[PDB]
Amino acid sequence: SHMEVRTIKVFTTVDNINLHTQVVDMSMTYGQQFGPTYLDGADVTKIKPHNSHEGKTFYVLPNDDTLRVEAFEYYHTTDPSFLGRYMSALNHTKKWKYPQVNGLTSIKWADNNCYLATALLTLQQIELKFNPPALQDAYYRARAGEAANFCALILAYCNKTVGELGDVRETMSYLFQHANLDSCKRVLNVVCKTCGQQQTTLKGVEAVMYMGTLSYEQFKKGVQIPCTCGKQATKYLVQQESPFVMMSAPPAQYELKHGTFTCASEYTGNYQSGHYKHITSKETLYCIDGALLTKSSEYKGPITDVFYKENSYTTTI
Ligand SMILES: [Cl-]
Ligand SMILES: [Zn+2]
């Protein structure tokens, strides 16, 4: 009653570069032989091999020491569910569209991906280099217009699934964690009429992000914050060394003035449902909303994040 054994050669991988020769029995599923298995994002764990699969590359989970090392070196994570979440996302993002809008790779709206579109548009306007080879390779392709792998990696690194509501500031925080910001430096001073003054120094990601005001000029002049004594103290920027800065705040009506910022994100909605748009300051003000594009000489809206150019700043206060 035994059926004659039939096999094909396939390759397994965790980085799509280093390949691992395998011989699979076509009477057993991929899952029975490799564990969870994916073909360009599609879950084929429960699929039995097809003749058309011969010679193709399948992603698997890091289930031996060689694969564990290859996966860490490429992705800089050892989260056991990472590859499954990346493939699950990729199965969707490979079907998204990535139109060039005003010279930048955007994303046509789908699956609540507006926060990803404005993040991707923002990255193309600031100086930033990623550390994991996976992000280096995928971001290069995204700049060229093939952003499916990059978007699926953002989702995996942020632990977001396709369709989940995302926050732009949080998303940028994750991407900045995987970028080389080592030389970025920020010095702050906080002045309380009662308690005196206290200087602090921040480095890396914390040197380029601030939550509380959208205006870089106001940050240099001073913003009011609580002091432990109960009074409000004044916090201001003393010194800044970085190629950009990111200023964030809860969404509030805010006026964006041409030539005074690099780009910004706008959020219309509430804590459960909303929509992001991107504003970029070039020869005029362009509003990029996924595949849509409009222009205006002035802009006012519920802004959440503003990016500014920088190199070296020292206060005169
Ligand atoms: Cl890079
Ligand atoms: Zn005080």
Q: How was this structure determined?
A: X-ray
Distance between Cα 199 and ligand 2 center (Å): 14
Tokens of 288: 């990029």
Question: What is the longest distance spanned by two Cα atoms in the chain?
Answer: 91
Residue 229 in marked binding region: yes
CA distances for 169 relative to 108, 208, 250, 286, 301, angstroms: 21, 12, 10, 21, 17
Q: Please write down the long-range contacts of 196-201, taking CB distance under 8 Å and 24 or more positions apart.
A: 199/238
Rounded Cα distance, 158 and 160, in Å: 5
CB-CB contact of 190 with 233 (8 Å) = yes
CA of 187 to the centre of ligand 2 (A): 20
Question: For the chain, what are the domain ranges?
Answer: 7-61
**Residue type present at position 38:** Y
CA 225, CA 277: separation in Å to the nearest integer? 29
Beta-carbon neighbours within 5 Å of ion ligand 2: 192, 194-195, 227, 229, 231
Three-class SS of the chain: CCCCCCEEEEEEECCCCCCEEEEEECCCCHHHHHCCEEECCEECCCCCCCHHHCCCEEEECCCCHHHHHHHHHHHCCCCCCHHHHHHHHHHHHCCCCCCEECCEECCCCCCCCHHHHHHHHHHCCCCCCECCHHHHHHHHHHHHCCCHHHHHHHHHHHCCCCCCCCCHHHHHHHHHHCECCCCCEEEEEEEECCCEEEEEEEECHHHHEEECCCCHHHHHHCEEEECCCCCEEEEEEEEEECCEEEEEEEEEEEEECCCCCCEEEEEEECCCCEEEEEEEECCCEEEEECCEEEEECCEEEEEEEEEEECCEEECCC
Cβ neighbours of 39 (radius 10 Å): 18
183-217 burial string, b = 16+ CB within 10 Å, else e? ebbbbbbbbbeeeeeeeeebebbebbbbeebbbbe
Residues 159 and 171 sit within 8 Å (Cβ to Cβ): no
Question: Taking the mean position of all CA atoms in its chain, how far away is CA 268?
Answer: 20
Q: What is the C-alpha separation between 195 and 188, in angstroms, rounded?
A: 16
| DSSP bridge partners of 199 | 189
Q: How far is it, in rounded angstroms, from Cα 122 to Cα 104?
A: 10
Q: Are 25 and 19 in contact (CB under 8 A)?
A: no
Strand partners, 22: 10
Considering every ligand atom shown, identify the ligand nearest to the alpha carbon of residue 229 and give its number: 2
- Active site (annotated) includes residue 289: yes
Across the strands, what pairs with 275?
268
Instruction: Look at domain 7-61 and name its CATH class.
Output: alpha beta
CA distances from 53 to 15, 24, 261 (A): 19, 10, 51
- End-to-end CA, the chain: 89
Strand order in the sheet with 244-256: 209-211, 244-256, 299-309, 263-269, 274-281, 285-289, 292-296
Q: 203 has which bridge partners?
A: 185
272: which residues sit within 8 A by CB, 6+ positions away? 165
Write down the residue that tokens 């994040």 correspond to.
305
Strand partners, 43: 38
Tokens read off for 141: 């392709």
> Resolution to 1 decimal, in Å?
1.8
Per annotation, catalytic residue among 114, 151, 158, 263: 114
- Nearest ligand to the C-alpha atom of residue 198: 2
Residue 42's nearest CA partner among 55, 56, 28 is 56
Token pair in block for residue 87:
């493939």
What tokens does 112 get?
């609540």
Query: Residue written as tokens 């802009």?
Result: 299
Question: How are beta strands 37-39 and 57-60 bridged, if at all?
Answer: antiparallel
Q: Is 227 annotated as a binding residue?
A: yes
Distance in Å, CA 178 to ligand 1 centroid:
10
Tokens of residue 163, six digits: 């369709």
Count CA within 13 A, CB hemisphere, residue 208. Answer: 29
Instruction: Convert 128-147 to b/e letters by CB count within 10 Å (16 or more is b).
Output: bebebebbebbbeebeeeeb
Q: How far is the CA of 131 from the centre of ligand 1 (A)?
A: 7
275 is an active site residue? yes
**Which residues are registered as beta bridge partners of 292?**
289
CB neighbours of 77 closer than 8 A, spacing ≥ 6? Answer: 71, 132, 157
**Choice among 158, 184, 287, 289 that is catalytic:** 289
Q: Which amino acid is residue 184, in one-letter code?
A: C
Closest to 166 in 3D by CA, of 291, 213, 174, 245: 174
Q: Residue 181 Cα, ligand 1 centroid: separation in angstroms?
A: 12
Active site residue 79: no
